[PDB]
């Protein structure tokens, strides 16, 4: 099981930032994917999660008008797929390390994360 994230990004305030997490080695569908933001001066904050089979988004109620999650699958190759994130209206308040992770098997209705990526970071 491996989660591979894209590199660091810098953006002009008000611009959107898009980051991504490529997942492999387990069936991509099943096992919800969660996003968590780390702010060195505040701690961890949950942003939302995506249902990789259905293509459904669930968000933390701070970001409904700002954060969009998407997924890409190919029924051909069940062991591979990606999750993308788009965050709009980026401000200095959003300087953080953005992490990708996967829920512990048996906990799709919850969100402990067993596997983690690297952290973007953004600005």
């Amino acid at each position: 099981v491996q989660l591979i994230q894209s590199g660091p990004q810098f953006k002009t305030p008000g611009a959107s930032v898009t980051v991504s997490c490529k997942a492999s080695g387990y069936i991509f569908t099943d096992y919800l994917i969660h996003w968590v933001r780390l702010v060195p001066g505040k701690g961890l904050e949950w942003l939302g999660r995506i249902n990789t089979n259905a293509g459904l988004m669930y968000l933390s109620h701070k970001f409904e008008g700002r954060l969009i999650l998407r997924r890409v699958v190919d029924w051909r190759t069940p062991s591979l797929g990606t999750v993308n994130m788009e965050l709009r209206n980026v401000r200095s308040d959003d300087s953080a390390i953005y992490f990708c992770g996967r829920v512990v098997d048996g906990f799709n209705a919850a969100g402990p994360l067993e596997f983690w990526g690297q952290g973007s970071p953004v600005i």
């Binding site: 099943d30 089979n53 259905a54 293509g55 459904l56 988004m57 051909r76 799709n108 209705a109």
Partner: protein, 450 residues
Amino acid sequence: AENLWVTVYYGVPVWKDAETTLFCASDAKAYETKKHNVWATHCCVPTDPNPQEIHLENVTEEFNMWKNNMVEQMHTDIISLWDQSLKPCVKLTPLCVTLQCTNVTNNITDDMRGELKNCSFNMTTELRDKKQKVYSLFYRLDVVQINKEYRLINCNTSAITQACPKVSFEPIPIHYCAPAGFAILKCKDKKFNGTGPCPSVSTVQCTHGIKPVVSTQLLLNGSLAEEEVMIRSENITNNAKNILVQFNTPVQINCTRPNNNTRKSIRIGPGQWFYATGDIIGDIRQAHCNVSKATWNETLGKVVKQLRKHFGNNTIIRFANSSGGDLEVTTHSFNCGGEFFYCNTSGLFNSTWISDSITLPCRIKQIINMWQRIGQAMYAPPIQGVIRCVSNITGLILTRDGGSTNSTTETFRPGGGDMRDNWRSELYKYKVVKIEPLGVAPTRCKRRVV
């Protein structure tokens, strides 16, 4: 210990689970005169002559609709037929040129503002030293603004082909039939949940007629449950799997595309034609679908009553609309009278259960990626006149969000998922087995040597 000898029997009624290739067949009646129907050409073998069904007394067999290779085969063959019928069409490579576009403002309602673009461009001609200035209307969802300059969306990744104007992708019913040496077993129990030891089994020559209708969220024109609404899933407590809900009564939905629409053809080359959308006759308004309100209440009451059997009879069940970053994961996609619709179902999945009509606004597209490919794209020619479809909603694809709060509630939303879930809703009753006629057993006879 008796003094017995081996006796060999041939023609013994024994079988093993097996994977194979089914050959497909159709009812050569009204469908025989369709001529250009894709399904009527492929599933050519005539069937359903008052077909046989044989009850097997005392046979109990294990079924598993989630591991049923018949669905995977149906999926693969549908894709192959679509590629084969598009392969010999025009290939509209010459259209990915800069387009000069303005808004259509000619008697448009408020809900259509910015929906249509009037685009002119320099197209190739049949004689290769000339160019022509032509124009066509496009839907907003088919173009990309670049740098009034636009391009078609599918320029970065693929050529766009054009469906051939005479090919009809109408989902007439087809039947799957076993090859010699194989048999299809059918599970007849009413209230069968898709898995396990089905006690009432019969053999068939072929499956019932199945219409290969392709849609998301709401399953259209399938079979109905025999007695009660059925809820089936691979694992009901795992909010990652989809829930397939089969209604025991249809909900009628009336879909239309208003706007009289005209069509014109343009030569792009020597016998190579492109179909353009011409000016709309009459006014311009949105496509939409009508669902009876009382009916889409009574049938949710039935779905909820059945969901409570798995989630608790003191649990609050609420429905909510789809949420995601795409069109293909939030709308009800279907093909109607040849055109592709993407309808908004948030007007249906909006209620809480604690123990006139609904109008669904709808958008349409002409450039379809189809299935899940990145390259490969199709342009659907416009259809003249107006379009009206009357369809039966026979089932739902639902997902749960996960748990919620200590108030004990569950939230269900229209789901997405692979196209295979549409076929699993019809083929759940069938299994394919290989017949193995030899066997041996003890008897009192001995070969008499002479």
